[PDB]
Amino acid sequence: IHCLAVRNFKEAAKLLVDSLATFTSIELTSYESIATYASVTGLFTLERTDLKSKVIDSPELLSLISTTAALQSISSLTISLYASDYASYFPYLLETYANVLIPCKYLNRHADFFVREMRRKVYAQLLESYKTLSLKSMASAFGVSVAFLDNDLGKFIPNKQLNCVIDRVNGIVETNRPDNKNAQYHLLVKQGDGLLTKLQKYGAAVRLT
Amino acid sequence: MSLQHEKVTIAPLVLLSALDHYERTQTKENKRCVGVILGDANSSTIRVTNSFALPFEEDEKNSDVWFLDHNYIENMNEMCKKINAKEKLIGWYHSGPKLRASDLKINELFKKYTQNNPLLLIVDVKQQGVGLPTDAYVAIEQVKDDGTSTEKTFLHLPCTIEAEEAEEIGVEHLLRDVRDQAAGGLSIRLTNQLKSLKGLQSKLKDVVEYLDKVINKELPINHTILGKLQDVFNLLPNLGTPDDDEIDVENHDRINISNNLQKALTVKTNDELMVIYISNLVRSIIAFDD
Amino acid sequence: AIRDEIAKNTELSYDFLPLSNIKALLFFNNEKETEKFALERNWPIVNSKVYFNNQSKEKADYEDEMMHEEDQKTNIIEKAMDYAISIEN
């Protein structure tokens, strides 16, 4: 829950899956909220396949069923990402904001942060699987209008965590993400630059003394 | 006779022994030491284990006139069995700088005693060649399809060595050179890399001027040579192939490994930089204390 | 000065312009003035259409021609040699 209140939900995921398997209730907020926390972190951290096996490697999440509004709203969303429902997905996103994030102490810091990130994921997965889409159809899949759809996308693309471009004349969405040798090359040099920097300052400091 | 051959393997002893026997007949100036060649055959690889001198006279007036002492050859072979009963005639060595046309007539005489076509191993005594100082031929008789009669001719085979391990360390023991024509570290193979390219230049020169010699000085148009030359071009790359583009991608790959390896080495030495500073740092105190 | 500036720019931007589109961009009001500049700036306008990609080749070719030229191209062979000698320094 400390990892949940700060921006690293990756750690939070790793601790809270253990907490499902065995829960210790005294002095710790009740088990339906603990389900809601596992599900929040699950959506953010994982992708389709991983997500599905996580909530089948937790039988308890499914057998607990939605028994509170916050649990219901997060669980509806969990299913739709991994089942690759986009249709009812876009409404569920609004429900999670209302009934989980603002009511919760720790996710009220993440009310704007979550909604922003979660939209990247749902788009990401669809675009990776496609070379090209049409915009109107992509808008319909989610349940938005064509023009509305760009706006959300157009914040994610220059941050370059979505690796795509949008023709507005063909109306096609192009996907030009390297996933080959070129991607591994592109990542590696950043780390190797980092190594150069670490040595540049430490080198100087020892030589002068 | 075996009419199947592929390679000639040579023991190191053979070369050295013919040079010794050469100076002790005191041969030079078209008087060339010729002895018998001993070893294993009925094998595509001719494996030459030993060699010995024969009493031989070479006339320098005519090399088609020669003396060979035939009787001696049988007696010597019986003593070869005393040493090891698996050494027989498989040819004869020549000590000269190169092939003579009297060597074809000489080769006739050793056919009588060989179960294999007889070997000519030129042991140079000036030690030329950019590989081994030995050239190797075996005499073959064949029809020639160029419209010329049946020749017996010496056709080239590769030269290789097979050295006993026991003997080979004697070569290392004798040799005080740290070797610059054989593999070692980076710098040593950096010479080996340049050396090979300079070997290709010399070999590439000789073909060009042979081709000039054929159509102005009228040396035989030999189809068998020129056929292997046609295959040099067909096996030669062409720019703009996706195979030679893959070479560019493959360059990136190994250079990057060098790039990270170079960083790794730089890290490790910077640990020793700090160590030595900690050694100086302590030794300030010891000095100050004294 | 401005006429020259935009004429460099259009090499990158275009490869095809009609005559009308050239006239506006170079800030000319006369058609003959556009064709006058195009001869002197060495634009091959043939059939009232420019081919700026010819023009990029010239400017790129000029950057190579100046002798520096071994290490400007940068030889595959030369990189490996450099790496080697530093280790064996």
Coordinates of C-alpha atoms in Angstrom, one line a residue:
Chain A
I1 CA 0.0 0.0 0.0
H2 CA 3.0 2.4 0.4
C3 CA 4.1 1.5 -3.2
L4 CA 0.5 2.1 -4.2
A5 CA 0.5 5.6 -2.8
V6 CA 3.7 6.5 -4.8
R7 CA 4.1 6.0 -8.5
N8 CA 5.9 2.6 -8.5
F9 CA 3.0 0.1 -8.9
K10 CA 5.4 -2.5 -10.3
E11 CA 6.6 -3.3 -6.8
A12 CA 3.1 -3.0 -5.5
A13 CA 2.0 -5.8 -7.8
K14 CA 4.7 -8.1 -6.6
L15 CA 3.9 -7.6 -3.0
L16 CA 0.0 -7.7 -3.4
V17 CA -0.2 -11.0 -5.3
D18 CA 1.4 -12.6 -2.2
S19 CA -1.2 -10.9 -0.1
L20 CA -4.1 -12.6 -2.0
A21 CA -2.7 -16.1 -1.4
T22 CA -2.5 -15.3 2.2
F23 CA -4.1 -12.3 3.9
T24 CA -3.5 -11.0 7.4
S25 CA -6.6 -9.0 8.3
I26 CA -5.8 -7.4 11.7
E27 CA -4.5 -3.9 11.5
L28 CA -4.9 -4.0 7.7
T29 CA -7.8 -2.8 5.6
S30 CA -10.3 -5.5 4.7
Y31 CA -9.9 -8.2 2.0
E32 CA -12.4 -6.8 -0.6
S33 CA -10.2 -3.6 -0.7
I34 CA -7.1 -5.8 -1.1
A35 CA -8.7 -7.4 -4.2
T36 CA -9.4 -3.9 -5.5
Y37 CA -5.7 -3.0 -5.0
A38 CA -4.4 -6.1 -6.8
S39 CA -6.7 -5.4 -9.7
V40 CA -5.6 -1.7 -10.0
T41 CA -1.9 -2.6 -10.1
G42 CA -2.7 -5.5 -12.5
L43 CA -4.3 -3.3 -15.2
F44 CA -1.4 -0.8 -15.1
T45 CA 1.6 -3.2 -15.0
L46 CA 0.6 -6.2 -17.2
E47 CA -0.7 -6.9 -20.7
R48 CA -3.3 -9.4 -22.0
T49 CA -1.7 -12.8 -21.5
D50 CA 0.1 -12.0 -18.2
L51 CA -3.1 -10.4 -16.8
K52 CA -5.2 -13.4 -17.6
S53 CA -2.9 -15.9 -16.0
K54 CA -2.5 -13.6 -12.9
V55 CA -6.3 -13.7 -12.1
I56 CA -6.5 -17.4 -12.8
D57 CA -3.4 -17.9 -10.6
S58 CA -5.6 -16.1 -8.0
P59 CA -8.8 -18.2 -7.7
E60 CA -9.9 -16.0 -4.8
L61 CA -10.4 -12.9 -6.9
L62 CA -13.0 -14.7 -9.0
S63 CA -14.7 -16.6 -6.2
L64 CA -14.9 -13.4 -4.0
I65 CA -17.1 -11.8 -6.7
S66 CA -17.9 -8.1 -6.8
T67 CA -19.4 -7.4 -3.5
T68 CA -18.6 -3.6 -3.3
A69 CA -18.8 -0.8 -5.9
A70 CA -15.1 -0.2 -6.1
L71 CA -14.4 -3.9 -6.6
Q72 CA -17.1 -4.1 -9.3
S73 CA -15.8 -1.2 -11.3
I74 CA -12.1 -2.4 -11.3
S75 CA -13.0 -6.0 -12.1
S76 CA -15.3 -5.1 -15.1
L77 CA -12.3 -3.3 -16.5
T78 CA -9.8 -6.2 -15.8
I79 CA -11.8 -8.6 -18.0
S80 CA -12.3 -6.3 -20.9
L81 CA -8.6 -5.6 -21.4
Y82 CA -7.5 -9.2 -21.6
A83 CA -10.6 -10.4 -23.4
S84 CA -9.8 -7.5 -25.8
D85 CA -13.2 -5.9 -25.5
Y86 CA -12.9 -2.3 -26.4
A87 CA -16.6 -1.7 -26.9
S88 CA -17.6 -1.5 -23.2
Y89 CA -14.1 -0.8 -22.1
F90 CA -14.3 3.0 -22.6
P91 CA -17.2 3.4 -20.2
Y92 CA -15.7 1.2 -17.5
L93 CA -12.7 3.6 -17.5
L94 CA -14.9 6.4 -16.3
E95 CA -16.4 4.1 -13.5
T96 CA -13.1 3.3 -12.0
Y97 CA -12.3 7.0 -11.7
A98 CA -15.5 7.7 -9.8
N99 CA -15.7 4.7 -7.4
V100 CA -12.1 3.7 -6.8
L101 CA -9.6 6.4 -7.3
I102 CA -11.2 9.4 -5.6
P103 CA -12.6 7.5 -2.7
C104 CA -9.3 5.8 -2.0
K105 CA -6.7 7.6 0.1
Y106 CA -3.8 6.3 -2.0
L107 CA -5.3 6.5 -5.5
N108 CA -6.6 10.0 -5.1
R109 CA -3.0 11.0 -5.9
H110 CA -3.4 8.8 -9.0
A111 CA -6.8 10.0 -10.2
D112 CA -5.3 12.0 -13.2
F113 CA -2.2 9.8 -13.4
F114 CA -4.1 6.5 -13.8
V115 CA -6.6 7.7 -16.5
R116 CA -3.8 9.1 -18.6
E117 CA -1.7 5.9 -18.4
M118 CA -4.6 3.4 -18.8
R119 CA -5.6 4.8 -22.2
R120 CA -2.1 4.3 -23.5
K121 CA -2.3 0.6 -22.8
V122 CA -5.6 -0.1 -24.5
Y123 CA -4.5 1.7 -27.6
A124 CA -1.0 0.2 -27.5
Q125 CA -2.0 -3.4 -27.8
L126 CA -4.4 -2.9 -30.7
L127 CA -1.8 -0.9 -32.7
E128 CA 1.0 -3.4 -32.1
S129 CA -1.2 -6.1 -33.6
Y130 CA -2.0 -4.0 -36.7
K131 CA 0.1 -2.6 -39.5
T132 CA -2.7 -0.2 -40.4
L133 CA -6.2 0.6 -39.1
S134 CA -8.8 3.0 -40.3
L135 CA -9.6 5.9 -37.9
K136 CA -13.3 5.8 -38.1
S137 CA -13.4 2.1 -37.3
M138 CA -10.9 2.5 -34.4
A139 CA -13.1 5.2 -33.1
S140 CA -16.2 2.9 -33.3
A141 CA -14.4 0.1 -31.6
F142 CA -14.0 2.2 -28.5
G143 CA -17.2 4.1 -28.9
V144 CA -16.0 7.6 -29.5
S145 CA -16.2 9.9 -32.6
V146 CA -13.3 10.2 -35.1
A147 CA -12.1 13.6 -34.2
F148 CA -12.4 13.0 -30.5
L149 CA -10.1 9.9 -30.7
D150 CA -7.0 11.7 -32.1
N151 CA -6.8 14.1 -29.2
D152 CA -6.0 11.4 -26.6
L153 CA -3.7 9.6 -29.1
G154 CA -1.9 12.8 -29.9
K155 CA -0.5 13.3 -26.5
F156 CA 0.8 9.7 -26.3
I157 CA 2.6 9.7 -29.7
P158 CA 5.2 12.4 -29.2
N159 CA 6.2 11.0 -25.8
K160 CA 6.8 8.1 -28.0
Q161 CA 5.4 5.3 -25.8
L162 CA 3.0 4.4 -28.6
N163 CA 5.3 4.5 -31.6
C164 CA 2.8 5.4 -34.4
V165 CA 1.6 8.2 -36.8
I166 CA -1.8 9.2 -38.1
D167 CA -2.7 10.0 -41.7
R168 CA -5.6 12.5 -41.8
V169 CA -6.0 12.3 -45.5
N170 CA -6.0 8.6 -46.1
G171 CA -7.5 8.3 -42.6
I172 CA -5.2 5.4 -41.9
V173 CA -3.2 4.9 -38.7
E174 CA 0.3 3.8 -39.5
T175 CA 2.3 1.7 -37.1
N176 CA 6.1 2.0 -37.6
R177 CA 7.4 0.5 -34.4
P178 CA 10.7 -1.5 -34.8
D179 CA 10.6 -4.8 -33.0
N180 CA 13.7 -6.2 -34.6
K181 CA 17.4 -5.7 -34.2
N182 CA 16.8 -2.0 -34.6
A183 CA 14.8 -1.7 -31.4
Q184 CA 17.4 -3.6 -29.3
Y185 CA 20.0 -1.3 -30.8
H186 CA 18.0 1.8 -29.9
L187 CA 17.5 0.8 -26.2
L188 CA 21.1 -0.4 -25.7
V189 CA 22.8 2.9 -26.6
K190 CA 21.0 4.8 -23.9
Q191 CA 22.4 2.4 -21.2
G192 CA 25.8 2.6 -22.7
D193 CA 25.7 6.3 -22.7
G194 CA 24.8 6.1 -19.1
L195 CA 27.9 4.0 -18.4
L196 CA 30.0 6.6 -20.2
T197 CA 28.6 9.4 -17.9
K198 CA 29.1 7.4 -14.6
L199 CA 32.8 6.9 -15.5
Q200 CA 33.3 10.5 -16.7
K201 CA 32.6 12.1 -13.3
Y202 CA 34.0 9.3 -11.1
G203 CA 37.2 9.2 -13.2
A204 CA 37.8 12.9 -12.8
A205 CA 37.1 12.9 -9.0
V206 CA 39.7 10.2 -8.2
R207 CA 42.4 11.5 -10.5
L208 CA 42.3 15.0 -9.0
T209 CA 42.5 13.8 -5.4
Chain B
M1 CA 49.3 -48.2 -59.4
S2 CA 46.9 -45.9 -57.5
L3 CA 45.4 -43.3 -59.9
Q4 CA 43.6 -41.7 -57.1
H5 CA 45.3 -38.9 -55.2
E6 CA 44.2 -35.8 -53.4
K7 CA 46.9 -34.4 -51.1
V8 CA 50.4 -34.9 -50.0
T9 CA 51.2 -34.9 -46.3
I10 CA 54.9 -34.4 -45.5
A11 CA 56.7 -35.1 -42.3
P12 CA 59.2 -32.3 -41.3
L13 CA 62.1 -34.8 -41.3
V14 CA 62.0 -35.3 -45.0
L15 CA 62.7 -31.7 -46.0
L16 CA 65.6 -31.3 -43.5
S17 CA 67.2 -34.6 -44.4
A18 CA 67.3 -33.8 -48.2
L19 CA 69.0 -30.5 -47.4
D20 CA 71.6 -32.4 -45.3
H21 CA 72.2 -35.0 -48.0
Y22 CA 72.5 -32.3 -50.6
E23 CA 75.5 -30.6 -49.0
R24 CA 77.2 -33.9 -48.4
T25 CA 77.1 -34.9 -52.0
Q26 CA 78.3 -31.3 -52.4
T27 CA 75.7 -30.7 -55.2
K28 CA 75.1 -27.3 -56.9
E29 CA 74.9 -25.8 -60.4
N30 CA 72.6 -28.3 -62.2
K31 CA 74.0 -31.2 -60.3
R32 CA 71.1 -31.8 -58.0
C33 CA 70.8 -34.4 -55.3
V34 CA 68.1 -37.0 -56.0
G35 CA 67.3 -39.7 -53.5
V36 CA 64.4 -42.0 -52.9
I37 CA 61.3 -41.2 -51.1
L38 CA 59.9 -43.5 -48.5
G39 CA 56.5 -43.7 -46.9
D40 CA 52.9 -44.8 -47.0
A41 CA 50.7 -44.9 -50.1
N42 CA 47.8 -46.5 -51.8
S43 CA 46.2 -43.6 -50.1
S44 CA 44.9 -40.4 -51.7
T45 CA 46.9 -38.6 -49.2
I46 CA 50.6 -39.4 -49.9
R47 CA 52.2 -39.6 -46.4
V48 CA 56.0 -39.3 -46.7
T49 CA 57.7 -40.3 -43.5
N50 CA 61.4 -40.5 -44.6
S51 CA 63.9 -40.0 -47.4
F52 CA 67.4 -41.2 -48.1
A53 CA 70.1 -40.5 -50.7
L54 CA 71.0 -42.8 -53.5
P55 CA 74.2 -42.7 -55.3
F56 CA 73.3 -40.5 -58.3
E57 CA 75.1 -38.5 -60.9
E58 CA 73.5 -35.7 -62.8
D59 CA 75.3 -34.5 -65.9
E60 CA 75.0 -30.8 -66.5
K61 CA 75.7 -31.0 -70.2
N62 CA 72.6 -33.1 -70.6
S63 CA 70.1 -33.8 -67.9
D64 CA 68.5 -36.5 -70.1
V65 CA 71.7 -38.3 -69.4
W66 CA 71.8 -39.3 -65.8
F67 CA 73.1 -42.1 -63.6
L68 CA 71.0 -44.1 -61.3
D69 CA 72.5 -47.0 -59.3
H70 CA 69.5 -49.5 -59.4
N71 CA 71.1 -52.4 -57.4
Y72 CA 71.6 -50.1 -54.3
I73 CA 67.9 -49.4 -54.1
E74 CA 66.9 -53.0 -53.3
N75 CA 69.6 -53.3 -50.6
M76 CA 68.6 -50.1 -48.9
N77 CA 64.9 -51.1 -48.8
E78 CA 65.7 -54.3 -46.8
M79 CA 67.4 -52.0 -44.2
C80 CA 64.3 -49.7 -44.3
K81 CA 62.3 -52.7 -43.0
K82 CA 64.8 -53.2 -40.1
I83 CA 63.9 -49.6 -39.0
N84 CA 60.2 -50.1 -39.8
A85 CA 58.6 -52.6 -42.2
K86 CA 56.0 -50.0 -43.4
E87 CA 58.2 -47.8 -45.6
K88 CA 58.3 -48.4 -49.3
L89 CA 59.1 -46.4 -52.4
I90 CA 56.4 -43.8 -53.2
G91 CA 58.5 -41.6 -55.4
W92 CA 61.7 -39.7 -55.5
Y93 CA 62.7 -36.2 -54.3
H94 CA 64.4 -33.5 -56.4
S95 CA 66.5 -30.9 -54.6
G96 CA 66.4 -28.2 -57.4
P97 CA 64.6 -24.8 -57.5
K98 CA 62.0 -26.1 -60.0
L99 CA 60.6 -28.8 -62.3
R100 CA 62.8 -30.1 -65.1
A101 CA 61.5 -32.0 -68.2
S102 CA 64.2 -34.6 -67.7
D103 CA 62.2 -35.4 -64.5
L104 CA 59.6 -37.1 -66.5
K105 CA 62.1 -39.6 -67.9
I106 CA 63.5 -40.2 -64.4
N107 CA 60.0 -40.9 -63.0
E108 CA 59.8 -43.9 -65.3
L109 CA 62.4 -45.8 -63.5
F110 CA 60.8 -45.7 -60.0
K111 CA 57.4 -47.0 -61.5
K112 CA 59.0 -50.4 -61.4
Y113 CA 59.1 -50.5 -57.6
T114 CA 56.0 -48.5 -56.6
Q115 CA 52.4 -49.5 -56.1
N116 CA 51.5 -45.9 -56.6
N117 CA 52.3 -43.3 -59.2
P118 CA 55.7 -41.8 -58.3
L119 CA 55.9 -38.6 -56.3
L120 CA 58.1 -35.7 -57.1
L121 CA 58.8 -33.7 -54.0
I122 CA 61.0 -30.6 -54.8
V123 CA 62.9 -29.9 -51.6
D124 CA 64.3 -26.4 -52.1
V125 CA 67.7 -25.6 -50.5
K126 CA 67.1 -21.9 -50.8
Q127 CA 63.8 -22.3 -49.0
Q128 CA 61.5 -20.3 -51.2
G129 CA 57.7 -20.3 -51.1
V130 CA 55.4 -18.2 -49.0
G131 CA 54.0 -21.4 -47.5
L132 CA 56.2 -24.5 -47.2
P133 CA 59.5 -24.7 -49.1
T134 CA 58.2 -27.8 -50.9
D135 CA 56.3 -28.2 -54.1
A136 CA 54.6 -31.4 -54.8
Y137 CA 53.6 -33.2 -58.0
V138 CA 52.7 -36.7 -58.9
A139 CA 53.1 -38.0 -62.4
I140 CA 49.8 -38.9 -64.1
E141 CA 49.3 -40.1 -67.7
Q142 CA 46.0 -38.8 -69.3
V143 CA 44.4 -38.0 -72.6
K144 CA 44.2 -34.3 -73.2
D145 CA 41.0 -33.1 -74.7
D146 CA 42.6 -29.9 -76.3
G147 CA 43.4 -31.8 -79.5
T148 CA 46.9 -32.7 -78.3
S149 CA 48.3 -36.2 -77.6
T150 CA 48.4 -38.2 -74.5
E151 CA 50.9 -36.8 -72.1
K152 CA 52.5 -38.0 -68.9
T153 CA 52.7 -34.8 -66.9
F154 CA 53.2 -33.6 -63.4
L155 CA 50.0 -32.3 -61.9
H156 CA 50.1 -30.3 -58.8
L157 CA 48.5 -31.4 -55.6
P158 CA 48.3 -29.4 -52.3
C159 CA 51.1 -29.7 -49.7
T160 CA 50.3 -30.3 -46.0
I161 CA 52.2 -31.7 -43.1
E162 CA 51.6 -34.5 -40.6
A163 CA 54.1 -34.4 -37.8
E164 CA 54.4 -36.8 -35.0
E165 CA 53.7 -35.1 -31.6
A166 CA 57.1 -36.4 -30.3
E167 CA 58.9 -34.8 -33.2
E168 CA 56.9 -31.6 -33.2
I169 CA 58.0 -30.6 -29.7
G170 CA 61.6 -31.1 -30.9
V171 CA 60.8 -28.4 -33.5
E172 CA 59.5 -26.1 -30.8
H173 CA 62.6 -26.9 -28.6
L174 CA 64.9 -26.1 -31.4
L175 CA 63.1 -23.0 -32.5
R176 CA 63.7 -19.9 -30.4
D177 CA 61.4 -17.7 -32.4
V178 CA 58.2 -16.6 -30.8
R179 CA 56.3 -16.9 -34.2
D180 CA 54.8 -14.1 -36.2
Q181 CA 53.5 -16.2 -39.1
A182 CA 51.4 -18.4 -36.7
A183 CA 48.6 -17.4 -34.4
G184 CA 49.1 -15.5 -31.1
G185 CA 47.7 -12.4 -29.7
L186 CA 45.9 -9.5 -31.5
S187 CA 49.1 -8.0 -32.8
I188 CA 50.4 -11.3 -34.0
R189 CA 47.3 -12.1 -35.9
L190 CA 47.2 -8.5 -37.2
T191 CA 50.4 -9.4 -39.0
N192 CA 48.9 -12.7 -40.1
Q193 CA 46.0 -10.7 -41.5
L194 CA 48.2 -8.3 -43.5
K195 CA 50.5 -11.2 -44.5
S196 CA 47.6 -13.1 -46.2
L197 CA 46.5 -10.0 -48.2
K198 CA 50.1 -9.5 -49.4
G199 CA 50.2 -13.2 -50.3
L200 CA 47.1 -12.7 -52.5
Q201 CA 48.8 -9.8 -54.3
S202 CA 51.8 -11.9 -55.4
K203 CA 49.6 -14.8 -56.5
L204 CA 47.2 -12.5 -58.3
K205 CA 50.2 -10.9 -60.3
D206 CA 51.4 -14.1 -61.8
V207 CA 48.0 -15.0 -63.4
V208 CA 47.8 -11.6 -65.1
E209 CA 51.1 -11.9 -66.8
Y210 CA 50.6 -15.6 -67.7
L211 CA 47.5 -14.5 -69.7
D212 CA 49.6 -11.8 -71.5
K213 CA 52.2 -14.5 -72.3
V214 CA 49.6 -16.7 -74.0
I215 CA 48.3 -14.3 -76.7
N216 CA 51.7 -12.5 -77.6
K217 CA 54.4 -15.1 -76.8
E218 CA 52.2 -18.0 -77.6
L219 CA 52.2 -20.3 -74.5
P220 CA 49.6 -23.2 -74.7
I221 CA 46.0 -22.2 -74.3
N222 CA 45.4 -24.7 -71.4
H223 CA 41.7 -25.1 -70.9
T224 CA 41.9 -26.8 -67.5
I225 CA 43.6 -23.7 -65.9
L226 CA 41.3 -21.2 -67.5
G227 CA 38.2 -23.2 -66.4
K228 CA 39.1 -22.8 -62.8
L229 CA 39.6 -19.1 -63.6
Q230 CA 36.0 -18.9 -65.0
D231 CA 34.8 -20.2 -61.6
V232 CA 36.7 -17.6 -59.8
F233 CA 34.4 -14.9 -61.3
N234 CA 31.2 -16.9 -60.7
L235 CA 32.0 -17.4 -57.0
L236 CA 33.0 -13.6 -56.8
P237 CA 30.5 -11.3 -55.2
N238 CA 28.4 -8.6 -56.8
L239 CA 27.5 -5.3 -55.1
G240 CA 23.8 -4.8 -54.2
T241 CA 23.1 -8.3 -53.0
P242 CA 21.1 -8.8 -49.8
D243 CA 23.8 -11.2 -48.7
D244 CA 26.4 -8.5 -48.8
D245 CA 23.9 -6.2 -47.1
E246 CA 23.7 -8.7 -44.3
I247 CA 27.4 -8.3 -43.9
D248 CA 26.8 -4.7 -42.9
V249 CA 24.3 -5.9 -40.3
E250 CA 26.7 -8.5 -39.1
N251 CA 29.5 -5.9 -38.8
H252 CA 27.4 -3.9 -36.5
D253 CA 26.9 -6.9 -34.3
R254 CA 30.6 -7.9 -33.6
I255 CA 31.8 -4.3 -33.4
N256 CA 29.2 -3.6 -30.7
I257 CA 30.4 -6.6 -28.8
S258 CA 33.9 -5.1 -29.0
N259 CA 32.4 -1.7 -27.9
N260 CA 31.0 -3.3 -24.7
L261 CA 34.1 -5.4 -24.2
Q262 CA 36.2 -2.3 -24.4
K263 CA 34.0 -0.6 -21.8
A264 CA 34.3 -3.6 -19.5
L265 CA 38.1 -3.5 -19.6
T266 CA 38.0 0.3 -18.9
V267 CA 35.9 -0.4 -15.8
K268 CA 38.2 -3.0 -14.4
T269 CA 41.3 -0.9 -14.7
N270 CA 39.6 2.0 -12.9
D271 CA 39.2 -0.3 -10.0
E272 CA 43.0 -0.7 -9.9
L273 CA 43.3 3.1 -10.2
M274 CA 41.5 3.5 -6.9
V275 CA 43.4 0.6 -5.3
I276 CA 46.7 2.3 -5.9
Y277 CA 45.4 5.6 -4.5
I278 CA 44.4 3.7 -1.4
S279 CA 47.9 2.3 -1.3
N280 CA 49.4 5.8 -1.6
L281 CA 46.9 7.1 1.0
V282 CA 48.1 4.6 3.6
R283 CA 51.7 5.1 2.7
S284 CA 51.5 8.9 3.4
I285 CA 50.7 7.9 7.1
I286 CA 53.6 5.5 7.3
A287 CA 56.1 8.0 5.9
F288 CA 54.8 10.7 8.1
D289 CA 55.1 8.5 11.1
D290 CA 58.7 7.6 10.4
Chain C
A1 CA 18.7 37.9 -49.6
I2 CA 15.3 36.4 -48.8
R3 CA 14.8 35.2 -52.4
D4 CA 18.0 33.1 -52.0
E5 CA 16.9 31.8 -48.5
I6 CA 13.6 30.3 -49.6
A7 CA 15.2 28.9 -52.7
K8 CA 17.5 26.7 -50.5
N9 CA 14.5 25.7 -48.4
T10 CA 12.4 24.4 -51.3
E11 CA 15.1 21.8 -52.1
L12 CA 14.1 19.9 -49.0
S13 CA 10.3 20.7 -49.1
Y14 CA 9.6 19.9 -52.7
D15 CA 10.6 18.1 -55.8
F16 CA 7.6 19.3 -57.8
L17 CA 6.1 22.8 -58.1
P18 CA 4.1 24.4 -60.8
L19 CA 5.2 27.8 -62.1
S20 CA 2.4 29.6 -60.1
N21 CA 3.5 28.0 -56.8
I22 CA 7.2 29.0 -57.5
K23 CA 6.2 32.6 -58.3
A24 CA 4.4 33.1 -54.9
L25 CA 7.2 31.6 -52.8
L26 CA 10.1 33.6 -54.2
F27 CA 8.0 36.8 -53.8
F28 CA 7.8 37.6 -57.5
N29 CA 4.9 39.3 -59.2
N30 CA 6.2 38.7 -62.7
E31 CA 6.4 35.3 -64.4
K32 CA 9.6 36.2 -66.4
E33 CA 11.4 37.2 -63.1
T34 CA 10.7 33.7 -61.7
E35 CA 12.2 32.1 -64.9
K36 CA 15.1 34.6 -64.7
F37 CA 16.1 33.5 -61.2
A38 CA 15.6 29.9 -62.1
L39 CA 18.3 30.1 -64.7
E40 CA 20.8 31.9 -62.4
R41 CA 20.1 29.7 -59.3
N42 CA 20.5 26.7 -61.6
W43 CA 17.0 25.2 -61.2
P44 CA 16.1 22.9 -64.1
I45 CA 12.6 24.1 -64.7
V46 CA 11.5 22.1 -67.8
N47 CA 7.9 22.1 -68.8
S48 CA 7.1 24.6 -66.0
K49 CA 8.1 22.1 -63.3
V50 CA 11.2 22.0 -61.1
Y51 CA 13.2 18.9 -60.1
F52 CA 14.8 19.9 -56.9
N53 CA 16.3 16.4 -56.4
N54 CA 18.8 17.2 -59.1
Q55 CA 19.6 20.3 -57.1
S56 CA 20.1 18.4 -53.8
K57 CA 22.6 16.1 -55.6
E58 CA 24.8 19.1 -56.6
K59 CA 25.0 20.5 -53.1
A60 CA 25.7 17.1 -51.6
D61 CA 28.3 16.4 -54.3
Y62 CA 30.0 19.8 -53.5
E63 CA 30.3 18.8 -49.8
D64 CA 32.3 15.6 -50.8
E65 CA 34.5 17.2 -53.5
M66 CA 36.6 19.1 -51.0
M67 CA 39.7 17.0 -50.1
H68 CA 39.3 15.7 -46.6
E69 CA 37.9 12.8 -48.3
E70 CA 39.4 9.6 -46.9
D71 CA 38.1 10.1 -43.4
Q72 CA 34.9 11.9 -44.5
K73 CA 33.6 8.8 -46.2
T74 CA 35.1 6.7 -43.3
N75 CA 36.4 3.3 -44.4
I76 CA 35.2 0.1 -42.9
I77 CA 38.7 -1.2 -42.9
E78 CA 40.0 2.0 -41.2
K79 CA 37.7 1.6 -38.1
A80 CA 39.0 -1.8 -37.2
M81 CA 42.6 -0.7 -37.7
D82 CA 42.0 2.2 -35.3
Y83 CA 40.5 0.0 -32.7
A84 CA 43.4 -2.4 -32.9
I85 CA 46.3 0.0 -32.5
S86 CA 44.9 1.6 -29.4
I87 CA 44.8 -1.7 -27.6
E88 CA 48.4 -2.4 -28.9
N89 CA 49.7 1.0 -28.0

